[PDB]
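step 3/5: co-fold with zinc ion
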Amino acid sequence: RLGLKQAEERLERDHIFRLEKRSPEYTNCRYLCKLCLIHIENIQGAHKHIKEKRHKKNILEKQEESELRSLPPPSPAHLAALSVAVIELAKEHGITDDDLRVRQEVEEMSKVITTFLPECSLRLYGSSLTRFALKSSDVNIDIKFPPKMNHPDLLIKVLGILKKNVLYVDVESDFHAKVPVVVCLCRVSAGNDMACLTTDLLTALGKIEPVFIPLVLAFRYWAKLCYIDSQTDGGIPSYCFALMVMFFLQQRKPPLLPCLLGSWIEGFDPKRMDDFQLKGIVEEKFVKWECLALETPNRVSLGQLWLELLKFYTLDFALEEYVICVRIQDILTRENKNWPKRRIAIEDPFSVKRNVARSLNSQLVYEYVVERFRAAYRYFACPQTKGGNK
Amino acid sequence: GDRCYNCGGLDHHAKECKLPPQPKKCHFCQSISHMVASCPLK
RNA sequence: GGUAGUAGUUUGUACAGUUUGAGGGUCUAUGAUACAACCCGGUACAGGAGAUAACUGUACAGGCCACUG
Ligand SMILES: [Zn+2]
Ligand SMILES: [Zn+2]
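step 4/5: write tokens
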């Protein structure tokens, strides 16, 4: 009688717990696994489950997570060294205002095209506009055009010139992307309506929060190291990484970024915000709330922000459990929006119909991302020369 | 060669053992109140 | 444009159970004994459930080649 507990006591060391009451989905089964999420019916079955390769492969990961949680708190000197290291990393590889001015001086190419076509649709877009990367996401100029015209013929005629002049090198046109594009590295994709609406927000945040740019830049550099940034060949969309950072700052206990919607709203019904629609920024103010600066400035060492971000995305919460969104500070379940659970859920504020990040369906890539996150956390948190930074 | 883990019987090993888990027994004194390492009279 | 389904042939993971090759004692021992059976044993255990590869069908995530209500 009493000894029976000892028999399951061993099982208690592998995170195996007997069901308090019978579960309707598995009536026969009487056991559960915290890590594997599998039901069992007999103690012999539990012991067999202990021998499972995946059970131990997850037990080792749980032990590593526990070890990471137990790391000693960072010292002030280590924090300062890490902060200066992140500042150096951001400034060395960061698009500065001079580079953005050089890129703007797009105007010459617009002048060239205007001679051919009376109506020319050119607008700066991508990493240079946001200053959140160095030719990583939406490199150079990605254009947007109204839908009143016909995009295909426009694309053909505009690419005609870039192909005609022999001065340019390696000019092709690819239509395999979500929108037609021409490379000469120029990008011409007419019909965009929401991408500019998002880069407007990203540019607006550039100077409203000084620490926003360096943190997103460091995250982009780390993704480039890990190869997760590239949308093609799997991974996670390159630009949405910035949004990822925006989620951390927004979900941090002391927020560094105001909420896009919900900060000021009337008749707020959190059940569904699909009807609500946003618009372009208005003098760096809150996005259109008809149907982005904190009241008090926040300034903390960049190393502390980096450590908090790593803890948030590695040791704090389960990535699959909740979606990455910036519309509302409140956490939203994935099943509420009917989104898949295999792909990492990232939602840009201006479009909630589909997941922006759908290239992480492969579980191998997700496991690689998680293990790289853990490796980065242990590399940075543990004391090392120059604050344990690249 | 070794007693069954589940039942403490040399007849069958744990994998072959089919009976449900039952209180452990101290081999030295044949008492389930304590284990072999904690036997008082040993 | 949105939900769902669709013959094989393909995708990466995990997998009831079925079969090779590698596995763990070996030292703790007198003696037997045509191809006519059996073996003394000081120097052993702890609370501990014990292996890798080719088949066999399978819940998952999107497609090959695109289709249907
Ligand atoms: Zn037994
Ligand atoms: Zn005893």
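step 5/5: annotate
Residues B 26, 28-29, 31, 34, 36, 39 surround zinc ion (ligand 2) (CB under 6 Å).
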